[PDB]
């Protein structure tokens, strides 16, 4: 039978699995963000077209089930992020990775990132002059870091982190954590 | 035509993608191991058998000059992981993903770990009395830890970490860094 | 360094209003939290509210509600705690904070005719 | 609704002596699975000073005499080495729900 183009998607299967742990450019990280967002409603549109097509009967075996729960455990998500940004209005809450996010005051502006959780230590390494907290590359720093830094739930729990101690290394290199004092319920 | 079991495979790029990283359950990391080893011996016999049928021309226009490829690259990425091997026995060099290992100095026991990066400051949390280093969870250890770790390649590289400098946060927290400090070629 | 400079002592007539300011120095305005606090009669304290300069967003107690009101002056750097109201049991010292650690220097403030 | 009860009202303690208060919470101040708690040193004339933020963590400057300690409803703030520096007051914050409750206070004296 068919043999080539569906070894072909196989070759994909290693192109994932192995580079979704991109996080050092950010460009790659949106492209990855957004490939897993469109790839929700592409999924189910396909299941609903082999449900239709009544064929064998296996369309409504396996295939209305699967299609009704892909539905329904994506409504509830939607709704969730929506609600994520109802509270705080950053347009990073439809990520389809997780529902916290994580802000920071850099040079004169705010920088917001996804968090896939939120604990009571958060580290920070500044190699080479090159700022990443939350294995998120935030850009050229030095050690003239912020004392305080938020991570935001929709659920209530704003947590505000502080600045514990940075030490410095080899120069330009450095580390440092942040500990939570704070809690304030919405 | 084909719908089901196509669309079926859609659902394995959520199930990857998403899930895919250095988790902190180590059997699922394991499983994710084996599961990505397993892959590149199927494209090679799936690519064979779309090839040898000749069909339409197409099996000698892309099904060889593919093959090829994913075959020359398996060879060279085997040989690289048998000589890491060769310099440390830990059976962790097979792994697709890296040819870097981390030591891990723990109670009486070594502990041996993929590492995606060498990099001159490694970062250690203890959350909760539950040590992790470089993102693996190394199991329960307190504040009183190792001063000493090491950073194998295969390239004739031994790098040498000496812990700089560990705080203590809300009683069985904390967190501490390693720098680097030696190099050995071999 | 961080710093921060408060206005002064002020005497308010009862039924009047007052606004306080809290101008900062040594870092980006837009990024810390500005907590506001009042000490009186005394050695006891109370909690009044908070407000986050990047964007509004301000909280109270159930108490100070409908008394204090909290702006932002992001081109001066400045905070702007009212009081609306004044009645004799409204005098007391007023701080600001940031991180719980850099305080203002106090405002006392005298309601009395 | 947390109202904090730390009643030594006053205390006097000798140079050298350990100095202990006794703050305690009202209910359930253990929300996370960790207790927050702030500790303030304030003298006359001039605003609090921080110490302690979490239960521990003594604030960074801050000397190595103070030490916080408890849990569940029960906190203590010791000072062993009592120098004749600090004759301040000592407030206690909960750090956990909307009103963040103070402390009543505690007048520290040295005795001589």
């Known amino acids: 039978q068919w043999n080539l183009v569906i070894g072909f998607l196989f070759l994909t299967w290693i192109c994932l699995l192995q580079f979704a742990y991109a996080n050092r450019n950010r460009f790659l990280y949106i492209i990855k963000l957004i490939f897993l967002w469109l790839l929700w409603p592409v999924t189910l549109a396909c299941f609903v077209l082999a449900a239709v097509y009544r064929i064998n009967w296996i369309t409504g075996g396996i295939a209305i089930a699967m299609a009704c729960l892909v539905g329904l455990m994506w409504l509830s998500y939607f709704i969730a992020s929506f609600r994520l940004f109802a509270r705080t209005r950053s347009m990073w809450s439809f990520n389809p990775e997780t529902n916290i996010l994580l802000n920071v005051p850099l040079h004169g502006t705010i920088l917001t990132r996804p968090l896939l959780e939120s604990e009571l230590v958060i580290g920070a390494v500044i190699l080479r002059g090159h700022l990443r907290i939350a294995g998120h590359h935030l850009g050229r720093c030095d050690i003239k870091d912020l004392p305080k830094e938020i991570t935001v739930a929709t659920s209530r729990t704003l947590s505000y982190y502080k600045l514990g101690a940075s030490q410095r290394v080899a120069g330009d290199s450095g580390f440092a954590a942040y500990s939570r004092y704070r809690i304030g319920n919405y | 035509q084909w719908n089901l079991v196509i669309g079926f495979l859609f659902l394995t790029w959520i199930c990857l993608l998403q899930f895919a990283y250095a988790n902190r359950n180590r059997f699922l990391y394991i499983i994710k191991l084996i599961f990505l080893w397993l892959l590149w011996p199927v494209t090679l016999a799936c690519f064979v058998l779309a090839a040898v049928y000749r069909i339409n021309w197409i099996t000698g226009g892309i099904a060889i000059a593919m093959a090829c490829l994913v075959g020359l690259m398996w060879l060279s990425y085997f040989i690289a992981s048998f000589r890491l091997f060769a310099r440390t026995r830990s059976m962790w060099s097979f792994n697709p993903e890296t040819n870097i290992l981390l030591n891990v100095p723990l109670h009486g026991t070594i502990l041996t770990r993929p590492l995606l990066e060498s990099e001159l400051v490694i970062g250690a949390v203890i959350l909760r009395g539950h040590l992790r280093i470089a993102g693996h969870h190394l199991g329960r250890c307190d504040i009183k830890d190792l001063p000493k770790e090491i950073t194998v390649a295969t390239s004739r590289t031994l790098s040498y970490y000496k812990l700089g400098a560990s705080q203590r946060v809300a009683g069985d927290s904390g967190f501490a860094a390693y720098s680097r400090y030696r190099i050995g070629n071999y | 360094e961080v710093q921060l400079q408060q206005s002064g002592p002020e005497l308010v007539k009862p039924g009047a209003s007052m606004k306080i300011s809290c101008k900062t120095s040594?870092?980006?305005?837009?990024?810390?939290?500005m907590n506001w606090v009042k000490q009186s009669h005394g050695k006891n304290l109370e909690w009044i509210g908070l407000?986050?300069?990047?964007?509004?967003?301000?909280s109270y107690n159930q108490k100070f509600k409908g008394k204090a009101t909290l702006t932002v002056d992001k081109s001066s750097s400045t905070a702007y705690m009212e009081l609306l109201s004044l009645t004799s049991e409204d005098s007391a010292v007023y701080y600001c904070?940031?991180?719980?650690?850099?305080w203002g220097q106090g405002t006392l403030v005298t309601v009395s005719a | 609704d947390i109202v904090m009860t730390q009643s030594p009202a006053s205390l006097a303690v000798s140079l050298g002596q350990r100095a202990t208060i006794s703050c305690k919470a009202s209910?359930?101040?253990?929300?996370?699975?960790?207790?927050?708690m702030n500790w303030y040193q304030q003298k006359p004339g001039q605003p609090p000073k921080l110490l302690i933020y979490?239960?521990?963590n003594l604030e960074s400057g801050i000397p190595a005499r103070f030490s916080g300690s408890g849990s569940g409803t029960d906190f203590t703030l010791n000072i062993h080495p009592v120098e004749e520096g600090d004759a301040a007051t000592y407030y206690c914050?909960?750090?956990?729900?909307?009103?963040?409750?103070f402390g009543g206070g505690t007048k520290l004296e040295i005795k001589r």
């Open positions: 904070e940031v991180i719980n650690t850099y």
């Open positions: 040594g870092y980006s305005f837009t990024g810390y939290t």
């Open positions: 407000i986050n300069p990047y964007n509004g967003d301000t």
């Open positions: 209910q359930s101040i253990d929300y996370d699975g960790d207790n927050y």
């Open positions: 979490t239960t521990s």
């Open positions: 914050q909960q750090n956990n729900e909307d009103p963040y409750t």
